[PDB]
Design an enzyme around this catalytic site. Structure first.
Site, mmCIF file in Angstrom:
data_model
loop_
_atom_site.group_PDB
_atom_site.id
_atom_site.type_symbol
_atom_site.label_atom_id
_atom_site.label_comp_id
_atom_site.label_asym_id
_atom_site.label_seq_id
_atom_site.Cartn_x
_atom_site.Cartn_y
_atom_site.Cartn_z
ATOM 1 N N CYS A 1 0.763 -1.215 0.000
ATOM 2 C CA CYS A 1 0.000 0.000 0.000
ATOM 3 C C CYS A 1 0.819 1.303 0.000
ATOM 4 O O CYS A 1 0.081 2.395 -0.238
ATOM 5 C CB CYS A 1 -0.951 0.039 1.212
ATOM 6 S SG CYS A 1 -2.386 -0.954 0.867
ATOM 7 N N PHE B 1 -10.394 -4.001 0.476
ATOM 8 C CA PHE B 1 -9.574 -4.012 -0.736
ATOM 9 C C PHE B 1 -10.410 -3.942 -2.017
ATOM 10 O O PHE B 1 -11.499 -4.527 -2.117
ATOM 11 C CB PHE B 1 -8.705 -5.270 -0.779
ATOM 12 C CG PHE B 1 -7.739 -5.384 0.367
ATOM 13 C CD1 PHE B 1 -7.313 -4.252 1.050
ATOM 14 C CD2 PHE B 1 -7.259 -6.618 0.763
ATOM 15 C CE1 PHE B 1 -6.424 -4.352 2.112
ATOM 16 C CE2 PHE B 1 -6.370 -6.726 1.818
ATOM 17 C CZ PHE B 1 -5.950 -5.589 2.495
ATOM 18 N N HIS C 1 -2.782 8.066 1.820
ATOM 19 C CA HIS C 1 -3.269 6.744 1.454
ATOM 20 C C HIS C 1 -4.372 6.302 2.414
ATOM 21 O O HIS C 1 -4.136 6.229 3.629
ATOM 22 C CB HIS C 1 -2.166 5.694 1.458
ATOM 23 C CG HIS C 1 -2.695 4.321 1.217
ATOM 24 N ND1 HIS C 1 -3.228 3.936 0.006
ATOM 25 C CD2 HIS C 1 -2.864 3.272 2.056
ATOM 26 C CE1 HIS C 1 -3.658 2.689 0.093
ATOM 27 N NE2 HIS C 1 -3.453 2.264 1.328
ATOM 28 N N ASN D 1 -9.971 0.653 -0.907
ATOM 29 C CA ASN D 1 -8.515 0.573 -0.774
ATOM 30 C C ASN D 1 -7.947 -0.162 -1.984
ATOM 31 O O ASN D 1 -7.808 -1.387 -1.985
ATOM 32 C CB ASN D 1 -8.136 -0.111 0.535
ATOM 33 C CG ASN D 1 -6.624 -0.131 0.774
ATOM 34 O OD1 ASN D 1 -5.842 0.197 -0.116
ATOM 35 N ND2 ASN D 1 -6.214 -0.524 1.982
HETATM 36 C C1 LIG Z 1 -11.238 -1.919 9.952
HETATM 37 C C2 LIG Z 1 -11.892 -0.644 10.474
HETATM 38 C C3 LIG Z 1 -12.558 0.108 9.337
HETATM 39 C C4 LIG Z 1 -12.964 -0.971 11.519
HETATM 40 O O1 LIG Z 1 -13.430 0.292 11.942
HETATM 41 P P1 LIG Z 1 -13.992 0.507 13.486
HETATM 42 O O2 LIG Z 1 -15.216 -0.361 13.661
HETATM 43 O O3 LIG Z 1 -14.327 1.963 13.718
HETATM 44 O O4 LIG Z 1 -12.848 0.038 14.580
HETATM 45 P P2 LIG Z 1 -13.211 -1.101 15.726
HETATM 46 O O5 LIG Z 1 -12.075 -1.149 16.722
HETATM 47 O O6 LIG Z 1 -14.511 -0.749 16.403
HETATM 48 O O7 LIG Z 1 -13.377 -2.562 14.951
HETATM 49 C C5 LIG Z 1 -14.609 -3.260 14.991
HETATM 50 C C6 LIG Z 1 -14.350 -4.732 15.219
HETATM 51 O O8 LIG Z 1 -13.236 -5.323 14.124
HETATM 52 C C7 LIG Z 1 -12.228 -5.778 14.818
HETATM 53 N N1 LIG Z 1 -10.963 -5.472 14.153
HETATM 54 C C8 LIG Z 1 -10.618 -4.325 13.585
HETATM 55 N N2 LIG Z 1 -9.396 -4.436 13.091
HETATM 56 C C9 LIG Z 1 -8.946 -5.677 13.341
HETATM 57 C C10 LIG Z 1 -7.765 -6.397 13.083
HETATM 58 N N3 LIG Z 1 -6.659 -5.770 12.378
HETATM 59 N N4 LIG Z 1 -7.660 -7.654 13.491
HETATM 60 C C11 LIG Z 1 -8.656 -8.239 14.139
HETATM 61 N N5 LIG Z 1 -9.781 -7.607 14.411
HETATM 62 C C12 LIG Z 1 -9.951 -6.337 14.021
HETATM 63 C C13 LIG Z 1 -12.307 -5.037 16.195
HETATM 64 O O9 LIG Z 1 -11.727 -5.728 17.163
HETATM 65 C C14 LIG Z 1 -13.866 -4.965 16.392
HETATM 66 O O10 LIG Z 1 -14.320 -6.307 16.825
HETATM 67 P P3 LIG Z 1 -15.395 -6.408 18.054
HETATM 68 O O11 LIG Z 1 -16.328 -5.218 17.981
HETATM 69 O O12 LIG Z 1 -16.193 -7.683 17.926
HETATM 70 O O13 LIG Z 1 -14.626 -6.398 19.355
HETATM 71 C C15 LIG Z 1 -10.860 0.246 11.174
HETATM 72 O O14 LIG Z 1 -10.389 -0.453 12.284
HETATM 73 C C16 LIG Z 1 -9.643 0.536 10.281
HETATM 74 O O15 LIG Z 1 -9.677 1.332 9.410
HETATM 75 N N6 LIG Z 1 -8.422 -0.206 10.590
HETATM 76 C C17 LIG Z 1 -7.211 0.008 9.808
HETATM 77 C C18 LIG Z 1 -7.217 -1.025 8.686
HETATM 78 C C19 LIG Z 1 -5.847 -1.458 8.162
HETATM 79 O O16 LIG Z 1 -5.116 -2.065 8.862
HETATM 80 N N7 LIG Z 1 -5.489 -1.090 6.794
HETATM 81 C C20 LIG Z 1 -4.214 -1.480 6.209
HETATM 82 C C21 LIG Z 1 -4.526 -2.669 5.296
HETATM 83 S S1 LIG Z 1 -3.030 -3.183 4.396
#
Ligand SMILES: CC(C)(COP(=O)(O)OP(=O)(O)OC[C@H]1O[C@@H](n2cnc3c(N)ncnc32)[C@H](O)[C@@H]1OP(=O)(O)O)[C@@H](O)C(=O)NCCC(=O)NCCS
Ligand SMILES: CC(C)(COP(=O)(O)OP(=O)(O)OC[C@H]1O[C@@H](n2cnc3c(N)ncnc32)[C@H](O)[C@@H]1OP(=O)(O)O)[C@@H](O)C(=O)NCCC(=O)NCCS
Lengths: 376, 376
Positions: B150, B201, B289, B322
């Site tokens: 990314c 993705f 990004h 993404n």
């Molecule tokens: C994924 C995303 C959109 C979720 O948004 P959000 O709901 O506001 O954030 P939350 O902490 O409330 O996540 C919601 C649930 O997903 C789970 N979760 C989020 N990211 C996770 C991860 N990397 N691994 C495992 N679980 C994950 C959380 O634990 C939560 O589970 P639960 O409610 O049952 O306890 C946000 O976390 C995000 O943008 N993360 C960054 C993504 C990333 O790593 N991008 C790079 C990809 S190469």
């Protein structure tokens, strides 16, 4: 103000195979001794390869533990990745440490890292692994050159030239690390070109420091990178292909690969050297990727090269085999070492101008024009 | 004499999925509707993703023909390669043709090609395929940037800067082409981070022409690339990993990925902008990004960005998801188009200096400093 090679080092895995013994070993470990004619054909390939020995981190023991690697098309990519992704930066680190020791400056002055391999892709890449293993600065500017095959030893010089010349004070560490873990496989009487790879491919790593504007009080130039070109050969589509598959990296080689490279190489010489006023190809020093002995033989014949022009390239082929991108860097090291030992006037066999060729998929020819440095 | 972006174009596969409908579609096509809680969790992920739609060349029909792609860990790399290796250069060609049309010069003036993808490796690479599909010169100088994930939309600008500035007259075509063929897979209640990828993705391609010393009579500058840096974040090893396996590209994401990027981003701003005399991060235009909305939200909160600084980046995330390396290039196109439409003073939302960030495995931050161009 040209990009300048300041240090060169190489490394190989300890495990070595004598080429004269390889047909018997290979057909035994792949359980194919009933393939009497195909074994003799492989024997001829190994005899004609002009390789005396090859290094391979793959041992009988590892292959016994991964029997699908010994089939021709056994599902084995995961096994190959598990082995290769650790080996690639580990062997590269060995070469890098020695290059940095030769160079003699702190590794904190390394501003750029180019890592090159076709032995296995991962995220993050071998450049990341090497940065952490060596303890380079977190801010090192990395370029990861994956899967570009046998011309990529020249590609990284073409890349390093523009990085170092466009960035004052920069010092680039280049590491090429290649191995046979993704390509080793058992024999097939419908895939003879795959046997050619089994006769030729080998493990090795090379590392260089490159920088423009050397500091004469602390640094010692070996070669200057004057120009770097790349071209695709006409009507050559499909001649060399490599596919990353569930059975690993499958290799596909047409029989007229040597004819394509020899028929087209003089055009690269003309384009690279006519603007400098040079036309005598025996008047320049040569580094030629030894993709196979037939490429080197046919280039030599086509151009009328005196029989010792390709001595350094053939020596590396004999002692190490086809280590893909690493070969041309091994050859530069051999030539500068030999010229120092034999008291030649320059690091380029006493000549002032030189050419370095990478050959590989496309078909691609990489042409690098070098200047030697006097040996006082 | 700075490398200058002269044209930008984008392309997506026709097939689109509305994010609000995706949890039902995904859990049905992967035969996992009995996973009632995991489906609701996925529903929350898709709702929180801040993505309205995504393009995916993968259809129900193709997935039905390749059922192992619908398992979580079904053997399927060969199937994914067969699809992706054709799609990557094909979608890239669509974007490239449009960029070259905007630029308006003959394709024979393209001296360099950078191709970037993490959607599948092959030998020769997508750069070769694109060169033949477009009919670029055989002598085009190619750099193949594979599997860098990314942050690589910034990497290719860092690369293009040194290529164009070190080579007078050069014109670089950059193509980034990404898709979900290697990463799509069924759900697993022990691999939640894999579900996050399924929510985020997407497919897309972007193409640019870059060159130093624009000819004002025939070329139109959009941005100048002033500087380009790369750094690894402390204590972040293992936070984002992607492995090329027999089941395709498996994705591994730690929960504190957003915290690492937001905790460390200001250091990149300080290093990049303090030497220019700039310290107000609301006084520069932003391209970030959109790796996930939590990265953008936490950067915004940490730095005190006014809520519209990241509007262009969030718009592309909403309309396209993404698309890995392509995203930041989509965002540059959006911002310059919007600024022209809305009558802003510069291609950088009326501001003079800008920053473009790539985020990805390492953890790696790529920081590019841009200058806008006036809109007269
Ligand atoms: C994924 C995303 C959109 C979720 O948004 P959000 O709901 O506001 O954030 P939350 O902490 O409330 O996540 C919601 C649930 O997903 C789970 N979760 C989020 N990211 C996770 C991860 N990397 N691994 C495992 N679980 C994950 C959380 O634990 C939560 O589970 P639960 O409610 O049952 O306890 C946000 O976390 C995000 O943008 N993360 C960054 C993504 C990333 O790593 N991008 C790079 C990809 S190469
Ligand atoms: C492989 C090599 C060392 C063999 O040397 P050689 O024996 O002097 O050349 P020959 O034409 O006599 O080859 C011997 C046999 O191998 C076969 N062979 C060689 N190359 C082959 C290929 N690419 N595909 C299928 N068969 C091949 C020949 O047909 C011949 O078989 P036969 O005697 O039963 O009819 C030589 O051909 C060479 O160097 N080739 C270039 C290798 C190459 O492509 N390198 C790039 C790898 S990425």
């Amino acid at each position: 103000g040209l990009a300048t090679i300041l240090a060169i080092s190489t490394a190989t895995p300890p495990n070595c195979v004598i080429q004269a013994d390889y047909p018997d070993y290979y057909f035994k470990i792949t359980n194919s001794e009933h393939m009497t004619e195909l074994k003799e054909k492989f024997r001829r390939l190994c005899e004609k390869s002009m390789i005396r020995k090859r290094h391979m981190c793959l041992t009988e023991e590892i292959l016994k533990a991964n029997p699908n690697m010994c089939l021709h098309m056994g599902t084995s990519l995961n096994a190959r990745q598990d082995i290769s992704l650790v080996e690639v930066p580990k062997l590269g680190k060995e070469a890098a440490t020695k290059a940095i020791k030769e160079w003699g400056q702190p590794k904190s002055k390394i501003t750029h890292l180019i890592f090159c391999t076709s032995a296995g892709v991962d995220m993050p890449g071998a450049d990341y692994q090497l940065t952490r293993l060596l303890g380079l600065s977190p801010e090192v500017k990395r370029m990861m050159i994956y899967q570009q095959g046998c011309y990529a030893g020249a590609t990284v010089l073409r890349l390093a030239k523009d990085l170092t010349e466009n960035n004052k004070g920069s010092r680039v560490l280049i590491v090429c690390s290649e191995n046979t873990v993704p390509t080793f496989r058992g024999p097939s009487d419908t895939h003879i070109d795959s046997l050619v790879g089994q006769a030729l491919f080998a493990d090795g790593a090379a590392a260089l420091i490159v920088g423009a504007d050397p500091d004469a009080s602390i640094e010692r130039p070996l070669y200057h990178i004057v120009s770097a070109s790349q071209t695709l050969l006409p009507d050559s589509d499909g001649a060399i292909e490599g596919h990353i598959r569930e059975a690993g990296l499958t290799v596909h080689l047409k029989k007229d690969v040597p004819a394509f490279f020899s028929a087209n190489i003089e055009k690269s010489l003309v384009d690279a050297f006519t603007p400098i006023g040079i036309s005598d190809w025996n008047s320049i020093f040569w580094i030629a990727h030894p993709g196979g002995p037939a490429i080197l033989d046919q280039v030599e014949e086509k151009l009328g090269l005196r029989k010792d022009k390709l001595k350094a390239s053939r020596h590396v082929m004999s002692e190490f085999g086809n280590m893909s991108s690493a070969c041309v860097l091994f050859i530069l090291d051999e030539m500068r070492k030999t010229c120092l030992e034999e008291g030649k006037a320059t690091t380029g066999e006493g000549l002032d101008w030189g050419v370095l060729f990478g050959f590989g998929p496309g078909l691609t020819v990489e042409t690098v024009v070098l200047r030697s440095v006097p040996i006082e």
